[PDB]
Amino acid sequence: SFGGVSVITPGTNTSNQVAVLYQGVNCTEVPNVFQTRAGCLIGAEHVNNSYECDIPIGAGICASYQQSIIAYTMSLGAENSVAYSNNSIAIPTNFTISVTTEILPVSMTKTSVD
Amino acid sequence: QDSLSSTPSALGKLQDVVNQNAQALNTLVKQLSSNFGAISSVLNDILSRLCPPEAEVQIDRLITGRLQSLQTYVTQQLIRAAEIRASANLAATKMSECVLGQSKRVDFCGKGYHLMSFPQSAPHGVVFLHVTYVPAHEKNFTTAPAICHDGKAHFPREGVFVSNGTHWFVTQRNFYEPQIITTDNTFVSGNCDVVIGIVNNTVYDPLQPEL
Amino acid sequence: CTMYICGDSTECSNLLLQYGSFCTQLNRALTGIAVEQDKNTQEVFAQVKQIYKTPPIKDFGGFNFSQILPDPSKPSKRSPIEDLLFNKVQKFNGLTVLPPLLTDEMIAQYTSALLAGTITSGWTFGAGPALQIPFPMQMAYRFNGIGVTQNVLYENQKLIANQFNSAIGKIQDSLSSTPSALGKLQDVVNQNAQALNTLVKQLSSNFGAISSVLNDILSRLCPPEAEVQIDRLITGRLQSLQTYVTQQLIRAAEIRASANLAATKMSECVLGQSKRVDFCGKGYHLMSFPQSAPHGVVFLHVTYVPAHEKNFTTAPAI
Numbered sequence A: 001s002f003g004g005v006s007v008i009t010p011g012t013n014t015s016n017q018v019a020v021l022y023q024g025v026n027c028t029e030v031p032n033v034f035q036t037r038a039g040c041l042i043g044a045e046h047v048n049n050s051y052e053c054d055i056p057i058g059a060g061i062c063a064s065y066q067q068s069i070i071a072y073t074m075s076l077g078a079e080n081s082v083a084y085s086n087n088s089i090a091i092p093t094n095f096t097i098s099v100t101t102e103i104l105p106v107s108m109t110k111t112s113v114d
Numbered sequence B: 001q002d003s004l005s006s007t008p009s010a011l012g013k014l015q016d017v018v019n020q021n022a023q024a025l026n027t028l029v030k031q032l033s034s035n036f037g038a039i040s041s042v043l044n045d046i047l048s049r050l051c052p053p054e055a056e057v058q059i060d061r062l063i064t065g066r067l068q069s070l071q072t073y074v075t076q077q078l079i080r081a082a083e084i085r086a087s088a089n090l091a092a093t094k095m096s097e098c099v100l101g102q103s104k105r106v107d108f109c110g111k112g113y114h115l116m117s118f119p120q121s122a123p124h125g126v127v128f129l130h131v132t133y134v135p136a137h138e139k140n141f142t143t144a145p146a147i148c149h150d151g152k153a154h155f156p157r158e159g160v161f162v163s164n165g166t167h168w169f170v171t172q173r174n175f176y177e178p179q180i181i182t183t184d185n186t187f188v189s190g191n192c193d194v195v196i197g198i199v200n201n202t203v204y205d206p207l208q209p210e211l
Numbered sequence C: 001c002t003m004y005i006c007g008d009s010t011e012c013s014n015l016l017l018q019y020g021s022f023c024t025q026l027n028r029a030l031t032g033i034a035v036e037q038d039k040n041t042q043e044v045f046a047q048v049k050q051i052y053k054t055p056p057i058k059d060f061g062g063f064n065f066s067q068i069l070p071d072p073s074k075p076s077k078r079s080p081i082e083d084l085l086f087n088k089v090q091k092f093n094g095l096t097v098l099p100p101l102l103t104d105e106m107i108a109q110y111t112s113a114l115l116a117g118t119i120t121s122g123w124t125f126g127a128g129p130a131l132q133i134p135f136p137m138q139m140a141y142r143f144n145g146i147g148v149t150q151n152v153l154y155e156n157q158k159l160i161a162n163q164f165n166s167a168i169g170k171i172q173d174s175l176s177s178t179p180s181a182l183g184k185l186q187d188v189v190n191q192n193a194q195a196l197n198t199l200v201k202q203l204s205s206n207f208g209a210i211s212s213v214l215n216d217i218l219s220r221l222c223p224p225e226a227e228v229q230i231d232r233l234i235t236g237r238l239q240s241l242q243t244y245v246t247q248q249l250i251r252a253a254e255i256r257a258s259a260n261l262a263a264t265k266m267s268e269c270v271l272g273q274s275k276r277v278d279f280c281g282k283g284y285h286l287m288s289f290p291q292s293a294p295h296g297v298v299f300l301h302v303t304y305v306p307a308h309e310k311n312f313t314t315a316p317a318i
Ligand SMILES: *[C@@H]1O[C@H](CO)[C@@H](O)[C@H](O)[C@H]1NC(C)=O
Pocket: A013, B008
């Protein structure tokens, strides 16, 4: 058995704590231990809650710093059951003016090599 | 202004281009430290120590490696350039369709209903500020596809029929502004037998009291 | 890179160091591709603020969406059409496959939310809060969007719902009877498989060496003559890997453009009604519905097509 070793970290400007992912292996072959479909994750606490994805692990699993590093199934968003019926309509009585930013690259530095 | 002043990662899209180009150039220069099988990475060391028959073999090894390193660099620059070109093509389209006009293309010029956009210059790129209209504070109403009056089916000309629980009105679709249902804001098509969900209500004719 | 070229040979590994950063560059290039693949999926499917659900009672005025909505009796929670689409479409040498960030279940969940939003609130959920409207009234709005008066929808509602329901049924029957229907997705699978298999087969190449097998060289010859034979295998194997990565970068760029187009269609065909000709199907666009597929997306475009024309005399003015 062989594979990649990945280190999961918050910025060093927040914490020196890390978690380690042993890609493609069982936790039993490695020598807070959680077996993901991405491999064995060590140093992260698995929880049954769900949050927006912070640091992606793979196969629906993400990790974040909450203090300790945790691992969870990522949430896709809050649920919303729309009040549908055959004679019901919703109409705005107000509005807001929104301004948003979009950033695009246009050019690179023009290099030349002799 | 406040968001940009407080978010270091806001311009990552432009910073990544700067970083990727810097990492390619630095990688290329570092390859000059490679031996590629030669006795030394330094060409002058070879020339100063060995005479022509054995130097050429050592030089050939450095040439082979250095040529390969440069070919790798250029190929990567061509691929990277193509990606930047596509980004520039998109930016040019947005300038034409968001700044020089009002777009009906969904989510092309920001989230919400596009009103207008303003360009701002940035290092090696462009920033667009998209201004959109976003509906707010919605209320629930009862509705109907048509109104039945004098045996005739009436439909809205520009809006939708709504009831506040006791009275029927016609309103524009994206903003609640209820009006009395009249012959001037509706049109007639056929009798009331065909439309499913048609409701009974008075339709007012403005000339009725006049004559 | 090191395992592909040298396996567990320290002698080869030491020789490979003379080439500098080439292996690091190649590993970096493939990592960038992998990241983009997750970004591609997110750009296409994660275009909804909330996870919307359809009502318990599917009364939409005669319009039947059962073939595109999730079938709860199946553990995958795929629609009848999605389930059909999914049915229709190295390690030992240092070559590995990493899992997608979003699972197929998650992608199906995004698709379901987009469908639920469209059916219950039309195009409003893509601009702001989801605002409910009766489906027939939504369809009447979309008839106006193509220059047809709303009474035409209401007076022919039964006919229109029937034509719609039949058209959807044909999609299921067509896919069930056409092996080549999903070639666009199958080609991506095939091209990637042919690149990986080609790369592995190159390990059987001698490249001028006495043997393709590195251990044969090390077991038979001593260090002064082995290094020459090893250099030949390293040169060839490095060249083979560089070829692979370059092809993957070019292929990745093409897939990225395809994903960019898919994301645009999701926004302009699914989250709204498009006036762009032939952008959302042939005919006058009414609406579109997304369906998930292996490594891709399928759009079902609903259009209004004029029929049974008659000749009249006309005039510019009276
Ligand atoms: C690093 O942490 C400091 C607070 O200790 C914070 O002010 C600063 O913005 C952080 N830098 C980054 C890049 O987040």
